[PDB]
């Protein structure tokens, strides 16, 4: 679920999901179109595609269970949707962590008109 994903992001990166990742670039928060602005934005692009692979799941509301094994994120067995949603979120949180080095505040609240074109998953 969205709130769960948000806590995973905070635990991983030390940034609050809102507002750090909720309106970043072309794809973070309300992704949709255009060339991703940077690596972090690409993490959201891929996450969007990841959710897109699950058209009969409900990532915003469906809660999955996971644990931290030392620092490792380990998705625990739930429903198929939950498992798949968890893997999507786990990947995004790791991706955000791996790209904190290039995260740029200038992309927060990035305006829609600067995001044009369809990029295929």
């Amino acid at each position: 679920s969205l709130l769960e994903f948000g806590k995973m992001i905070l635990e991983e990166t030390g940034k609050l999901a809102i507002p750090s990742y909720s309106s970043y670039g072309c794809y973070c928060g309300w992704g949709g179109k255009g060339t991703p602005k940077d690596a972090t934005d690409r993490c959201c692009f891929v996450h969007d595609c990841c959710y897109g692979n699950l058209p009969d799941c409900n990532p915003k509301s469906d809660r999955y269970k996971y644990k931290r094994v030392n620092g490792a994120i380990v998705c625990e067995k739930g429903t198929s949707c939950e498992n798949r949603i968890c893997e999507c979120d786990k990947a995004a949180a790791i991706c955000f962590r791996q790209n904190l080095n290039t995260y740029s505040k200038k992309y927060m609240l990035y305006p829609d008109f600067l995001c044009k074109g369809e990029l295929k998953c």
């Binding site: 969205l2 994903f5 948000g6 990742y21 909720s22 973070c28």
Partner: peptide, 5 residues
């Protein structure tokens, strides 16, 4: 705040 990734 419930929405936004």
């Amino acid at each position: 705040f419930l929405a936004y990734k």
